[PDB]
Design a protein around this ligand. Structure first.
Ligand SMILES: C[N+](C)(C)CCOP(=O)(O)O
Length: 292
């Protein structure tokens, strides 16, 4: 649910003209917000039309705190992985050619610059030309990877829990497991004389992405061959994988268990890109849930 701004035009040289329009689609229910800025680059010195899409917005973590009254067993849900996907769903003249980030990255702050040079050259550099854009996001304790299904018409990224320190313990991940204590990701004490509901570390000691939200900044470059249809379809998906983290007292010690992607919340928008008129039109939005 949202709006699409009118198109703004910026004539660079006599060769290049930039056109921009921003679309916003939201899921109030899942607390996901997609802000999509389509930058069309018309370059007379290049035999292809270029589109630089910047995807920003918000994806809530889906965090659910534990019931403090839980005595011997308790659980909480946390935002373990954020997935953003872009797909060219029609028109064989259109392909996904470049993107940022373009490689795995576990730095606390991801910063990249994408530049377009007169003549068609796309360059991506680390840190913050006829056109330029940047991506900047914080992902402390998490790691960004390029989705396995990335190909000539598809690009995706995953921002997943990676190296999470408890106090000085760790690092722990979605898969860590101690032969005795299980996954200790958010376990406060192995022998705590406490209610289970009160034996997790505090929210402020957990990564911001795990208990708050993720503010994505991703860039995808689509190329149009200048032959065939002027319009094409594109889908943009924002998703969170929520893990069920639970702790239990067995009479002797505390042990933890993390169920990976136990709950999934997904928001997908479908737009029709009009490469001739530098506009986009919302065709559909779809909210989908998975609950194991
Ligand atoms: C914090 N931890 C539960 C992951 C490791 C053990 O801590 P502790 O029970 O020795 O205080």
């Amino acid at each position: 649910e949202g709006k699409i701004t009118p198109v703004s035009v910026k004539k660079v040289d006599d060769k290049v003209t930039l056109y921009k329009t921003t679309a916003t689609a939201d899921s109030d229910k899942f607390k996901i917000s997609q802000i999509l800025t389509f930058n069309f680059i018309k370059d007379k010195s290049y035999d292809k039309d270029t589109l630089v899409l910047k995807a920003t917005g918000n994806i809530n973590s889906g965090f659910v705190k534990p019931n403090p009254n839980d005595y011997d067993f308790s659980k909480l849900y946390w935002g373990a992985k954020y997935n953003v996907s872009i797909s060219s769903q029609s028109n064989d003249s259109v392909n996904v050619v470049d993107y940022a980030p373009k490689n795995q990255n576990e730095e606390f702050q991801v910063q990249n610059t994408l530049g377009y040079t007169f003549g068609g050259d796309i360059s991506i550099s680390n840190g913050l030309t006829a056109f330029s854009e940047t991506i900047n996001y914080k992902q402390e304790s998490y790691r960004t990877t390029l989705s396995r299904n990335t190909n000539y018409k598809n690009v995706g990224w995953g921002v997943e829990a990676h190296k999470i320190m408890n106090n000085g313990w760790g690092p722990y991940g979605r898969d860590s497991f101690h032969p005795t204590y299980g996954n200790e990701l958010f376990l406060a004490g192995r022998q705590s004389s406490a209610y289970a509901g009160q034996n997790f570390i505090a929210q402020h000691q957990m990564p911001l992405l795990s208990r708050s939200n993720f503010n994505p900044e991703f860039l995808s470059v689509l190329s149009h061959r200048q032959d065939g249809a002027k319009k094409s379809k594109i889908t943009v998906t924002y998703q969170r994988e929520m893990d069920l983290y639970q702790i239990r007292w067995n009479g002797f010690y505390w042990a933890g268990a993390n169920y990976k992607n136990f709950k999934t919340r997904t928001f997908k928008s479908t737009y029709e890109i009009d490469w001739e008129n530098h506009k986009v039109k919302l065709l559909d939005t779809k909210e989908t849930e998975n609950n194991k």
